[PDB]
Structures are given as structure tokens and as C-alpha cells.
Amino acid sequence: VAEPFAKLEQDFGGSIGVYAMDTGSGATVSYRAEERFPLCSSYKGFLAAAVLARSQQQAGLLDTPIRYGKNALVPWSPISEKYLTTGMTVAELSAAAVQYSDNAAANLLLKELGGPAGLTAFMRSIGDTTFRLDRWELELNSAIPGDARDTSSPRAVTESLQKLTLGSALAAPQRQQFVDWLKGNTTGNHRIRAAVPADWAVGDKTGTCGVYGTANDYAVVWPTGRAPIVLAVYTRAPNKDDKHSEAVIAAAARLALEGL
Ligand SMILES: *C(=O)[C@H]([C@@H](C)O)[C@H]1CC(SCCNC=N)=C(C(=O)O)N1
């Protein structure tokens, strides 16, 4: 089982972490599934989930307009930047955070939740004890070896995604909104999506720290007429200038799906 992944992570020059779960059969694949990896932008899926969970207690939260100044803008905010003159609702910021990895939107939503500690508190509320977000955009992307900040494990990411997209953690309408946002993600076509047949529905959230060969993807997959699959592929590398590889993420994802 682990043999194909070790092979892959030695063509890549760094570490690959993989965890996949068949929700019907209960079969799993694990490879470095309990090691910590930098979240990079991938926490933004759970951010949107946390915002949805809070809207269950705070009616009208999703429609709340957030009017921000030019100061709220940080690099890689392609949606947020376009609406500087009108603002965006919490729901619009959430879709932007998920589907375009919009950094200003994420910081705005983090603020709504009480900062990185607020998001970590939400992940604890659903029983995730591994996840930790400690910093804001963009410092959380530093991905320095040995730093436990802003990390989780492939297994913890998979279990939390499972609880949120298929389980009871979100109420029924919020749960479908979360799934819909992941399904409409625009940044992951070359990662986990590239490993499934095009006739299978996929929702995913990517992460790309830009340094230390650190990039990732987690996804829910619906095989046609089949129980849904949940999986996470995370990578890192020892040298700051080591390049991440979308191909390696897709190859790792295919090995996980061909192995369940
Ligand atoms: C998140 O990981 C980073 C961080 C700088 O906020 C941004 C950069 C990118 S943009 C395209 C990356 N390539 C493939 N996805 C994303 C991202 O979508 O991963 N988030």
C-alpha cells in the first residue's frame, strides 16, 4: 500500500501526506496521514464552514454586508478587490474565500469569527483536535519546517471535511451550501479533480503556500451511484525554493482512489 507513495514522494523530493475514506465501505488509505503539514489556503474551506455554522445561531449573518476600506486588501484578493466600492455580504466573501482563495475575504471572515483562534475554536467544536490556525493572511503561508502553527494532518482534514459535508456538524441547508461552494471551486482542476472521471462530482479546496514545495488539496467525491469518497493530499519539501507540484498531488490522489 504505502509502497507507491514512498516512490512518488522520492520523485518529488519531499513528503506527501495522504488520507482517503470510503464512507460506504469504510475502507481507508493512509500515508503519513497523521503528520502535520501547512494548511496554506486550504483552511479557507473550514472557514466558510465555520461561518455557516455560526449563521445557524445568528440569522441573517450570511446576508450581512461587510464594507471594507482599501486597507483590508492583501495580495491575491481578486474578488474582494473588485467590490471595494460597494462591499460584499458574508456569504459572498465565503464563496470568494472558497472558490478563488480570496485572501482579503478570508481575513474579513476570520475577523467575524474572532481571528485564527476563533476558527480553531470551531474546529474543536466538531471534535478536530489537530487543526490549528494561528496567524492571518498572509503570514500563515510561511510553511517553515518544524513550525506547528497553521497546520493539520491529512487524516484530521479528511475527518472534519467528512463531518461537515456528509455528517451532522452542519444543519441540512448550511451543509448543502458548504458542498455547493466546494463543488464550484475554480482552483483545483489539476489536483484531486484530475484523478477522478469527469462524470463524478467533486468539491475541493486547494492550498499553495508558494514556498517549501508546500501545496495541498482536499475533496469530497461522488462516484456515480456510489457512496461518497473523502480524501486529502498534502505536500511539503525541505528547501524554501523547492517547487510544489500539482501533478504530484493528482498522482497521489489517484493512488489513494485506486487503493480503496
Ligand atoms: C493559498 O494557498 C495561497 C495564499 C497566498 O493565500 C493562495 C495562492 C493561490 S492562487 C493559485 C494557486 N495554484 C493552484 N491552486 C491559492 C490557491 O488557490 O491554492 N491560494
PDB file of N, CA and C and ligand atoms in Angstrom, residues 40-41 44 76 101 103 137-138 141 187 191 205-209 246, ligand 1:
ATOM      1  N   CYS A  40      -1.812  26.188   4.337  1.00  0.00           N
ATOM      2  CA  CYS A  40      -1.877  27.193   3.283  1.00  0.00           C
ATOM      3  C   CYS A  40      -3.330  27.641   3.126  1.00  0.00           C
ATOM      4  N   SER A  41      -3.792  27.864   1.894  1.00  0.00           N
ATOM      5  CA  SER A  41      -5.145  28.362   1.675  1.00  0.00           C
ATOM      6  C   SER A  41      -6.236  27.349   2.009  1.00  0.00           C
ATOM      7  N   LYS A  44      -9.398  27.712   4.225  1.00  0.00           N
ATOM      8  CA  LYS A  44     -10.496  28.595   3.832  1.00  0.00           C
ATOM      9  C   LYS A  44     -11.798  27.828   3.629  1.00  0.00           C
ATOM     10  N   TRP A  76      -3.445  38.794  -3.715  1.00  0.00           N
ATOM     11  CA  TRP A  76      -4.324  37.690  -4.126  1.00  0.00           C
ATOM     12  C   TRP A  76      -5.728  37.827  -3.526  1.00  0.00           C
ATOM     13  N   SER A 101      -9.880  31.450  -3.374  1.00  0.00           N
ATOM     14  CA  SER A 101      -8.861  31.601  -2.339  1.00  0.00           C
ATOM     15  C   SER A 101      -8.604  33.066  -2.003  1.00  0.00           C
ATOM     16  N   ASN A 103      -7.853  36.281  -0.359  1.00  0.00           N
ATOM     17  CA  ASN A 103      -7.222  36.463   0.947  1.00  0.00           C
ATOM     18  C   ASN A 103      -7.887  37.561   1.774  1.00  0.00           C
ATOM     19  N   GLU A 137      -3.794  35.900   6.961  1.00  0.00           N
ATOM     20  CA  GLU A 137      -3.163  36.101   5.665  1.00  0.00           C
ATOM     21  C   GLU A 137      -2.306  37.363   5.738  1.00  0.00           C
ATOM     22  N   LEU A 138      -1.065  37.300   5.247  1.00  0.00           N
ATOM     23  CA  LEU A 138      -0.513  36.159   4.520  1.00  0.00           C
ATOM     24  C   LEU A 138       0.527  35.352   5.322  1.00  0.00           C
ATOM     25  N   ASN A 141       1.120  31.441   5.626  1.00  0.00           N
ATOM     26  CA  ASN A 141       1.626  30.671   4.499  1.00  0.00           C
ATOM     27  C   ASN A 141       3.131  30.454   4.538  1.00  0.00           C
ATOM     28  N   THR A 187     -10.016  26.582  -8.513  1.00  0.00           N
ATOM     29  CA  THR A 187      -8.556  26.483  -8.474  1.00  0.00           C
ATOM     30  C   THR A 187      -8.013  25.055  -8.445  1.00  0.00           C
ATOM     31  N   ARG A 191      -5.576  19.078  -9.611  1.00  0.00           N
ATOM     32  CA  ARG A 191      -5.166  18.331  -8.430  1.00  0.00           C
ATOM     33  C   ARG A 191      -6.091  17.130  -8.271  1.00  0.00           C
ATOM     34  N   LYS A 205     -10.992  22.063  -2.036  1.00  0.00           N
ATOM     35  CA  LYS A 205     -10.341  23.318  -1.680  1.00  0.00           C
ATOM     36  C   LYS A 205      -8.838  23.108  -1.733  1.00  0.00           C
ATOM     37  N   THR A 206      -8.155  23.959  -2.490  1.00  0.00           N
ATOM     38  CA  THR A 206      -6.720  23.843  -2.686  1.00  0.00           C
ATOM     39  C   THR A 206      -5.956  24.689  -1.670  1.00  0.00           C
ATOM     40  N   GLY A 207      -4.652  24.454  -1.617  1.00  0.00           N
ATOM     41  CA  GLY A 207      -3.742  25.309  -0.884  1.00  0.00           C
ATOM     42  C   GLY A 207      -2.396  25.320  -1.572  1.00  0.00           C
ATOM     43  N   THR A 208      -1.752  26.488  -1.648  1.00  0.00           N
ATOM     44  CA  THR A 208      -0.454  26.613  -2.311  1.00  0.00           C
ATOM     45  C   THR A 208       0.340  27.673  -1.553  1.00  0.00           C
ATOM     46  N   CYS A 209       1.240  27.238  -0.667  1.00  0.00           N
ATOM     47  CA  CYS A 209       1.948  28.222   0.148  1.00  0.00           C
ATOM     48  C   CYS A 209       2.918  29.050  -0.685  1.00  0.00           C
ATOM     49  N   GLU A 246       1.467  20.235  -8.794  1.00  0.00           N
ATOM     50  CA  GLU A 246       0.079  19.808  -8.908  1.00  0.00           C
ATOM     51  C   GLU A 246      -0.001  18.380  -9.427  1.00  0.00           C
TER      52      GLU A 246
HETATM   53  C1  LIG B   1      -3.257  29.815  -0.558  1.00  0.00           C
HETATM   54  O1  LIG B   1      -2.757  28.742  -0.551  1.00  0.00           O
HETATM   55  C2  LIG B   1      -2.470  30.963  -1.312  1.00  0.00           C
HETATM   56  C3  LIG B   1      -2.074  32.114  -0.308  1.00  0.00           C
HETATM   57  C4  LIG B   1      -1.070  33.059  -0.937  1.00  0.00           C
HETATM   58  O2  LIG B   1      -3.178  32.840   0.116  1.00  0.00           O
HETATM   59  C5  LIG B   1      -3.247  31.415  -2.419  1.00  0.00           C
HETATM   60  C6  LIG B   1      -2.455  31.370  -3.784  1.00  0.00           C
HETATM   61  C7  LIG B   1      -3.220  30.587  -4.633  1.00  0.00           C
HETATM   62  S1  LIG B   1      -3.621  31.134  -6.321  1.00  0.00           S
HETATM   63  C8  LIG B   1      -3.351  29.764  -7.488  1.00  0.00           C
HETATM   64  C9  LIG B   1      -2.564  28.642  -6.809  1.00  0.00           C
HETATM   65  N1  LIG B   1      -2.434  27.498  -7.701  1.00  0.00           N
HETATM   66  C10 LIG B   1      -3.403  26.411  -7.713  1.00  0.00           C
HETATM   67  N2  LIG B   1      -4.392  26.407  -6.943  1.00  0.00           N
HETATM   68  C11 LIG B   1      -4.289  29.883  -3.839  1.00  0.00           C
HETATM   69  C12 LIG B   1      -4.889  28.536  -4.234  1.00  0.00           C
HETATM   70  O3  LIG B   1      -5.949  28.508  -4.914  1.00  0.00           O
HETATM   71  O4  LIG B   1      -4.336  27.459  -3.886  1.00  0.00           O
HETATM   72  N3  LIG B   1      -4.412  30.382  -2.616  1.00  0.00           N
END
